[PDB]
Tab-separated table of C-alpha atoms and ligand atoms in Angstrom:
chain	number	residue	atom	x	y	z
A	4	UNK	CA	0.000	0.000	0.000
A	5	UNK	CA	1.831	3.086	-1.461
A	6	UNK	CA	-0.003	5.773	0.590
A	7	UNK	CA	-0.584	7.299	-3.509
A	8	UNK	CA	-3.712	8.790	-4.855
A	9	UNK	CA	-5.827	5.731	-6.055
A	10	UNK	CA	-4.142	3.400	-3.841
A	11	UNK	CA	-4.629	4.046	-0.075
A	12	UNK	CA	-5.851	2.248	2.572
A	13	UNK	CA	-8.918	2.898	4.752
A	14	UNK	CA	-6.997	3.690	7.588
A	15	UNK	CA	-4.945	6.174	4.973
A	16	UNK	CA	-8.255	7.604	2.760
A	17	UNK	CA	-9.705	8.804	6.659
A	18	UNK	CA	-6.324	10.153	7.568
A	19	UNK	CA	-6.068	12.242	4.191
A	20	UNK	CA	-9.818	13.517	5.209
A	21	UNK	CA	-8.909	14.525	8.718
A	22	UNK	CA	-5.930	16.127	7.368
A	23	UNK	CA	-8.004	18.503	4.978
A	24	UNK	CA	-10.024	19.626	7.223
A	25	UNK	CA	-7.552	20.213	9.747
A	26	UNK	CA	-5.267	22.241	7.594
A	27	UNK	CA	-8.012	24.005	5.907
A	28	UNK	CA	-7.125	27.207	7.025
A	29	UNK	CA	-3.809	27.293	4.673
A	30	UNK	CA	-4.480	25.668	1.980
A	31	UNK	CA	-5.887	29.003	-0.046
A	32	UNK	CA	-2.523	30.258	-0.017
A	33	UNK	CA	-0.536	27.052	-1.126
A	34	UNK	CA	-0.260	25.663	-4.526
A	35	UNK	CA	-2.189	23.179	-5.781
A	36	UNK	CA	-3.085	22.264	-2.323
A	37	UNK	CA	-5.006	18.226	-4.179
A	38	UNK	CA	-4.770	14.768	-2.505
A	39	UNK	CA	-1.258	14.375	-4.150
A	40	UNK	CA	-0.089	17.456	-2.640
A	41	UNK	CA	-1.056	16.874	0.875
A	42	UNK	CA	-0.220	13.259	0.899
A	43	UNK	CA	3.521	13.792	0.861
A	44	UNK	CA	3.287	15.400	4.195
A	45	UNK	CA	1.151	12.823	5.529
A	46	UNK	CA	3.283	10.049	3.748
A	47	UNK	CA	6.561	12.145	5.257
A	48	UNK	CA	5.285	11.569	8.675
A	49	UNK	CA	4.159	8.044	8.307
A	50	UNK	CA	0.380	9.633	8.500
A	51	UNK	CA	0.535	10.623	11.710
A	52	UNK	CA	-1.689	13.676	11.614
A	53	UNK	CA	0.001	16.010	14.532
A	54	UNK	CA	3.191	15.374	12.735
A	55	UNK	CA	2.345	16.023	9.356
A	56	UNK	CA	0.248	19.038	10.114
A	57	UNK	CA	3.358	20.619	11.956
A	58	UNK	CA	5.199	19.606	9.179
A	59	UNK	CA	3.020	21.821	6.464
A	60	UNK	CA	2.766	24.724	8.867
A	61	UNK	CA	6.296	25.182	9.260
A	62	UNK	CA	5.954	24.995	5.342
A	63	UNK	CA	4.177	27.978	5.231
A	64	UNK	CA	5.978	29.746	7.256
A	65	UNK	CA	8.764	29.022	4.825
A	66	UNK	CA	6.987	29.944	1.896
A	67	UNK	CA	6.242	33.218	3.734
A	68	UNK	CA	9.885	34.104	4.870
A	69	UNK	CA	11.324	33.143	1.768
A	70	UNK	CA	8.814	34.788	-0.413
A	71	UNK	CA	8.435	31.405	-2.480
A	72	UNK	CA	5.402	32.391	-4.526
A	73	UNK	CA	8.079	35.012	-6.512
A	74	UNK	CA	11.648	33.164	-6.092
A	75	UNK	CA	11.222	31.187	-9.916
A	76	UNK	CA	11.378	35.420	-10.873
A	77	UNK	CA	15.042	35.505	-8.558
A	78	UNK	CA	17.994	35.666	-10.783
A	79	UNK	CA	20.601	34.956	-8.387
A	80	UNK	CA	24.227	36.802	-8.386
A	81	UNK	CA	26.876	36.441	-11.122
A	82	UNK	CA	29.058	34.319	-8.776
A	83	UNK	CA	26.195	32.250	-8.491
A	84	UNK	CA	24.852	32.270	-11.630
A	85	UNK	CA	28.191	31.241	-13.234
A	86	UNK	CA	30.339	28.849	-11.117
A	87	UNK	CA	27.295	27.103	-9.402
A	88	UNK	CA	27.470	23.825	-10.894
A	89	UNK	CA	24.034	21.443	-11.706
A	90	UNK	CA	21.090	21.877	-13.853
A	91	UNK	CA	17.823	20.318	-15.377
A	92	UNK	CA	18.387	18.195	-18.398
A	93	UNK	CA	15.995	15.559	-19.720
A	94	UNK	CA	13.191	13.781	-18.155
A	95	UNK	CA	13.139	9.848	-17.444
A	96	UNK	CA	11.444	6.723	-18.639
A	97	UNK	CA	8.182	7.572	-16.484
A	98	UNK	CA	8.250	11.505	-17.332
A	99	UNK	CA	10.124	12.838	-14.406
A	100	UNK	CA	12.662	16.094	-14.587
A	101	UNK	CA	16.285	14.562	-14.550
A	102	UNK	CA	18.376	17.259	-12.107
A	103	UNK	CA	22.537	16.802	-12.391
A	104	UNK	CA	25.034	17.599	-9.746
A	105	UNK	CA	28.395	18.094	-10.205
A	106	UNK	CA	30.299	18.077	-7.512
A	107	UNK	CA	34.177	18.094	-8.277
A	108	UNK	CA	34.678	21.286	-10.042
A	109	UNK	CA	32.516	22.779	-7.301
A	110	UNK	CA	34.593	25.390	-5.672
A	111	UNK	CA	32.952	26.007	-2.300
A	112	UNK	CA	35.019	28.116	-0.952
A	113	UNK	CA	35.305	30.489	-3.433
A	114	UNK	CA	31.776	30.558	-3.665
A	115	UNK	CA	31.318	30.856	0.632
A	116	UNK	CA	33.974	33.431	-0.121
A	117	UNK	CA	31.635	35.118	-2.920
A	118	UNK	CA	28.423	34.933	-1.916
A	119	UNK	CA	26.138	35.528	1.237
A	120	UNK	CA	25.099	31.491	2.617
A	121	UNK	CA	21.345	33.386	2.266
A	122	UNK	CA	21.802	33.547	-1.424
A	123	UNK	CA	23.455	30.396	-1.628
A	124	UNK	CA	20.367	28.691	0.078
A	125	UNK	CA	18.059	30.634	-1.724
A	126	UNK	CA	19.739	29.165	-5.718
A	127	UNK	CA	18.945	25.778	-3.976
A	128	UNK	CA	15.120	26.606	-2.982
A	129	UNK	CA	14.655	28.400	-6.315
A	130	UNK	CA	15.587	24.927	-8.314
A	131	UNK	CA	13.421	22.816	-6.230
A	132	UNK	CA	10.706	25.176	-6.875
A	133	UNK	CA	11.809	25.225	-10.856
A	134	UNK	CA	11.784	21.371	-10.673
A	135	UNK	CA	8.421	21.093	-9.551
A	136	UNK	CA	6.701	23.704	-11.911
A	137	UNK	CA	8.689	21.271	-14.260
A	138	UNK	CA	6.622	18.381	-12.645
A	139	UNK	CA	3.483	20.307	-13.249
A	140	UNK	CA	4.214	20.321	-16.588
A	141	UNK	CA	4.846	17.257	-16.847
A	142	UNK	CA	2.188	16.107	-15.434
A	143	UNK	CA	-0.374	18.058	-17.867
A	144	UNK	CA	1.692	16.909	-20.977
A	145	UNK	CA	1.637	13.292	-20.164
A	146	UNK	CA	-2.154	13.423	-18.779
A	147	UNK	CA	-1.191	11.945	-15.060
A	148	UNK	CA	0.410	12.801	-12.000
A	149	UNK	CA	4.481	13.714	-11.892
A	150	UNK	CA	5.728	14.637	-8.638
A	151	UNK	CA	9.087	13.151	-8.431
A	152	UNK	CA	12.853	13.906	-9.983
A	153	UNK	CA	15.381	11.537	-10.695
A	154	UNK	CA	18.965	12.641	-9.786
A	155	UNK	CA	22.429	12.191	-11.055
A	156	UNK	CA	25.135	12.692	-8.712
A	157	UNK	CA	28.137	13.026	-10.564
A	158	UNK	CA	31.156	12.660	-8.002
A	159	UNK	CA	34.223	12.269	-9.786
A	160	UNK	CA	36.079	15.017	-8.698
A	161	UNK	CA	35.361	14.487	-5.119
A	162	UNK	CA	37.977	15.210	-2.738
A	163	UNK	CA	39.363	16.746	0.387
A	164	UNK	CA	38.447	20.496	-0.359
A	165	UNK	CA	34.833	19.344	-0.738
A	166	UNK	CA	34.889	18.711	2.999
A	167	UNK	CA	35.986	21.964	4.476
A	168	UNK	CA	33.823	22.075	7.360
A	169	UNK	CA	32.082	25.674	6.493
A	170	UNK	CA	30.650	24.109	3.023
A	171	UNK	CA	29.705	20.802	4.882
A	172	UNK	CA	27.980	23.121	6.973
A	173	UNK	CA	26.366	25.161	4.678
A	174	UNK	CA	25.204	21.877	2.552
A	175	UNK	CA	23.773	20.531	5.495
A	176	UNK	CA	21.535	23.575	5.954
A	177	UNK	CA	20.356	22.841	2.187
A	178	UNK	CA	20.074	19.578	2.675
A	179	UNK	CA	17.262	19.909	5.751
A	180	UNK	CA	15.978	22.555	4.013
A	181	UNK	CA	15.107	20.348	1.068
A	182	UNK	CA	13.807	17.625	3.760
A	183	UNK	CA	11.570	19.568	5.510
A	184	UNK	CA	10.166	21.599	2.505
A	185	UNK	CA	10.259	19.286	-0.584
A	186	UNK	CA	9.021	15.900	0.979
A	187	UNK	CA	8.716	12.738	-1.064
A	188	UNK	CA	10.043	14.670	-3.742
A	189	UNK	CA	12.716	12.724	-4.520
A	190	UNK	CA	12.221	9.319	-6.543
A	191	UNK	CA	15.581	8.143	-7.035
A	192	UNK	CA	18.932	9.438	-6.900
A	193	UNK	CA	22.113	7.731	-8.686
A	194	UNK	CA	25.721	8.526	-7.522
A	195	UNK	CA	27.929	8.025	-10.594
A	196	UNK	CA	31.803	7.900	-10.807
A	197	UNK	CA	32.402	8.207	-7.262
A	198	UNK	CA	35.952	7.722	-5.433
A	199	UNK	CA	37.143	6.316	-2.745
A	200	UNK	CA	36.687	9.275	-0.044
A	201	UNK	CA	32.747	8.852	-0.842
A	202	UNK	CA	31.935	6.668	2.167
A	203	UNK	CA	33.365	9.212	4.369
A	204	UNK	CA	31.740	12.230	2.595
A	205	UNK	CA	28.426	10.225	2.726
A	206	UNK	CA	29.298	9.825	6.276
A	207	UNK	CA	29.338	13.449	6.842
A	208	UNK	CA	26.450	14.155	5.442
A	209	UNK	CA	23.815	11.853	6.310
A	210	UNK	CA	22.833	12.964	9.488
A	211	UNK	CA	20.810	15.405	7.462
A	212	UNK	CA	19.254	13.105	5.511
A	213	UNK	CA	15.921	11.557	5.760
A	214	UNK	CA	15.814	7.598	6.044
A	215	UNK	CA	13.400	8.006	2.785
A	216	UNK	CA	15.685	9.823	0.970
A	217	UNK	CA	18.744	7.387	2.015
A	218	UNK	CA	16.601	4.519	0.384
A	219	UNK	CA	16.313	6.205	-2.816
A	220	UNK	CA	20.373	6.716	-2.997
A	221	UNK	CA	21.812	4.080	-5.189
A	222	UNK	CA	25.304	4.452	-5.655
A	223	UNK	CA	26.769	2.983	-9.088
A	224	UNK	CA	29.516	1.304	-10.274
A	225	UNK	CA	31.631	0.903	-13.306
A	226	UNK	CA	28.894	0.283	-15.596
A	227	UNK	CA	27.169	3.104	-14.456
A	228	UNK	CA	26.144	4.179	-17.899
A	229	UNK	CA	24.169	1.274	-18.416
A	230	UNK	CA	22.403	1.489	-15.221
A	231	UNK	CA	21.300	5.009	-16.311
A	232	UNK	CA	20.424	3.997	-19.832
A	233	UNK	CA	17.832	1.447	-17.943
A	234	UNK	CA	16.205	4.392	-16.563
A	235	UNK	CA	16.438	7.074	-18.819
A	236	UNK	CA	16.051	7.335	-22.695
A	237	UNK	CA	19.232	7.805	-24.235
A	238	UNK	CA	17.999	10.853	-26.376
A	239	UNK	CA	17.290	12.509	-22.700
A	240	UNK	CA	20.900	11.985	-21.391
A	241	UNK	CA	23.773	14.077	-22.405
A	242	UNK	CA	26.583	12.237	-24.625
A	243	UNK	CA	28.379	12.934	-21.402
A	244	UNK	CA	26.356	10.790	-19.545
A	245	UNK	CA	26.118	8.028	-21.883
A	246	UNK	CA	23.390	9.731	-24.188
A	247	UNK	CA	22.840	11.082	-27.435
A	248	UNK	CA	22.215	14.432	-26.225
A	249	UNK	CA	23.510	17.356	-26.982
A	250	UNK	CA	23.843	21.448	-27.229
A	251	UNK	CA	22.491	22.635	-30.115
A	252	UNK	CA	25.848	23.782	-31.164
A	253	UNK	CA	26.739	20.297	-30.599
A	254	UNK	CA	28.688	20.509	-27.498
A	255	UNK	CA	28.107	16.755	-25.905
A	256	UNK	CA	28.219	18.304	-22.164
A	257	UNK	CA	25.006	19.974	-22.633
A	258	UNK	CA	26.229	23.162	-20.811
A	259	UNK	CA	22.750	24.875	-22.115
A	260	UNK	CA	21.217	23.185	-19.473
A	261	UNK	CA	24.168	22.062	-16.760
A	262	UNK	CA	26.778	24.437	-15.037
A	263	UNK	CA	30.024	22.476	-14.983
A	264	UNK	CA	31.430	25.180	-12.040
A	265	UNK	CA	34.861	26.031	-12.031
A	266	UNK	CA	37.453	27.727	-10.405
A	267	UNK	CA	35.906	31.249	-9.373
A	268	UNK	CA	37.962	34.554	-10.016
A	269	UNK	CA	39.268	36.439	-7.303
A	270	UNK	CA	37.213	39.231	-8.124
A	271	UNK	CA	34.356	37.647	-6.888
A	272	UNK	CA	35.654	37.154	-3.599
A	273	UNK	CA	33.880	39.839	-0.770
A	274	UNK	CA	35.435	38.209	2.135
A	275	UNK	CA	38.579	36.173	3.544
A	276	UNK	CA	36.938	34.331	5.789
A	277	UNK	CA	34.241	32.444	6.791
B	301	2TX	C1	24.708	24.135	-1.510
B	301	2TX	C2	25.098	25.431	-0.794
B	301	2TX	C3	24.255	25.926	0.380
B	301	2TX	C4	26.331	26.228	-1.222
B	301	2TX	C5	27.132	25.686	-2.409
B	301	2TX	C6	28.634	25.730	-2.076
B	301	2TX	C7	28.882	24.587	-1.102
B	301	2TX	C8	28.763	24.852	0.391
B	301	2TX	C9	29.135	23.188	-1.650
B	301	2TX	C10	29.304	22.065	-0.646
B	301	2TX	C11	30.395	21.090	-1.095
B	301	2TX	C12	29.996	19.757	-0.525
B	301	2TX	C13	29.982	19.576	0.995
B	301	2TX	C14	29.485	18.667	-1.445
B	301	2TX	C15	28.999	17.435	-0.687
B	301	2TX	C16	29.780	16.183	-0.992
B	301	2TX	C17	29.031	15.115	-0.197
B	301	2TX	C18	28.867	13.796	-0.881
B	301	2TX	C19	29.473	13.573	-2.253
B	301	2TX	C20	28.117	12.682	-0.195
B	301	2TX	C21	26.906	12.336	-1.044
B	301	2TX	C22	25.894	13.450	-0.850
B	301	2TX	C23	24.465	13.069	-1.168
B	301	2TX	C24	24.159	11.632	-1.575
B	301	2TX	C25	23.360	14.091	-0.889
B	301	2TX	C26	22.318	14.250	-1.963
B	301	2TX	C27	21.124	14.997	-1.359
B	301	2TX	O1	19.799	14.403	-1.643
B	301	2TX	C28	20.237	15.572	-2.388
B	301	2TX	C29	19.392	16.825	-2.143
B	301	2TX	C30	20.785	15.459	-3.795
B	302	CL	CL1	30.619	37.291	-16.173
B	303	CL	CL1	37.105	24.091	14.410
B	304	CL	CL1	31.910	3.944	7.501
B	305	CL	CL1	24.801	4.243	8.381
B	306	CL	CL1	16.177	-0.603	-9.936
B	307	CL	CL1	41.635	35.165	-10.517
């Protein structure tokens, strides 16, 4: 029983009522506030109603702080805009946004060095809020519910400046973020090329993570390209990836759609410590 629209239990279809009405009072300002919507908060908290409501009302307090209705508007700084690595490219085998992360030519400290950790955290809530109005769209393109992203966690790269303690500090802060305010978003996430200080970077960081997201982390091996092919149409996945995909100029990277990052210039820098 997947706790999904058109599958629940009794004991789940009464819990999604009492949940309505007891939430009632926010749901005008939310989006979308239908069955699908408030059963990830319910399913986040294992349908325990006190739980789940808390859950959502801290959510709208977000939404409220962070002025979430208008942040898809937010272009963030240059620094940002240019060296922060990851993007949207391609959709899966069941019609869900692919999101990339590329994590060794991320250079977090010249971007803690370059940029406030509000506007860093704010890039991160603006793409979860891109990928779901990408979901949306989905979803009326394909005629049925998407809700979920597929991610590819590209880790080669990974090494000891990734775990300065300041940017495994600052991720962390993302990371709950995107726990408490983008539950059961998630559908699967693939770790590709990884080395061998990825146990203890995993380590590091999965005190923020949710045991439902840690499910939905498969890490990959050498025939990781294959594994992705299985889930993902090759036309959707940059030559990069193992695809056919590409730039229009041809570039097989797809940099149209994902920052690589890089090395940021000094004269970004507006601090010397952090
Ligand atoms: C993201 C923010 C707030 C600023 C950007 C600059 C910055 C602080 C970068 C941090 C660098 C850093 C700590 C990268 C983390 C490396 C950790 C790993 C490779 C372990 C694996 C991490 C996983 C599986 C988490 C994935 C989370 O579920 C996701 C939301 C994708
Ligand atoms: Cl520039
Ligand atoms: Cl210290
Ligand atoms: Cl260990
Ligand atoms: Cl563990
Ligand atoms: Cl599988
Ligand atoms: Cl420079």
């Amino acid at each position: 029983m997947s706790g999904r629209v058109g599958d629940l239990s009794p004991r789940q279809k009464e819990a999604l009522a009492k949940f309505r009405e007891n939430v009632q009072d926010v749901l005008p300002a939310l989006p979308n506030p239908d069955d699908y919507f408030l059963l990830r908060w319910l399913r986040a908290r294992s349908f325990d109603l006190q739980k789940s409501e808390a859950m959502l009302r801290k959510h709208v307090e977000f939404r409220k702080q962070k002025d979430i209705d208008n942040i898809i508007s937010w272009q963030p700084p240059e620094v940002i805009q240019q060296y922060l690595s990851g993007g949207m490219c391609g959709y899966d085998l069941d019609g869900c946004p692919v999101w990339y992360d590329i994590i060794g030519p991320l250079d977090a400290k010249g971007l803690l060095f370059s940029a406030s950790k509000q506007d860093l955290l704010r890039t991160k809530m603006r793409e979860c809020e891109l990928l779901l109005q990408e979901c949306a769209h989905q979803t009326t393109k394909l005629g049925r519910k998407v809700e979920t992203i597929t991610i590819i966690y590209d880790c080669e790269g990974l090494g000891l400046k990734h775990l300065w303690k300041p940017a495994v500090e600052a991720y962390g802060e993302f990371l709950c973020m995107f726990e408490e305010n983008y539950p059961e978003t998630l559908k699967r996430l693939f770790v590709v090329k990884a080395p061998k200080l990825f146990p203890v970077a995993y380590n590091l960081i999965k005190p923020f993570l949710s045991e439902d997201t840690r499910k939905k982390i498969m890490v990959l091996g050498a025939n990781w390209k294959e594994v992705l092919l299985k889930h993902i149409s090759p036309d959707q996945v940059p030559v990069e990836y193992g695809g056919t995909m590409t730039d229009p100029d041809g570039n097989p990277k797809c940099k149209s759609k994902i920052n690589y990052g890089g090395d940021i210039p000094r004269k970004y820098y507006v601090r010397d410590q952090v």
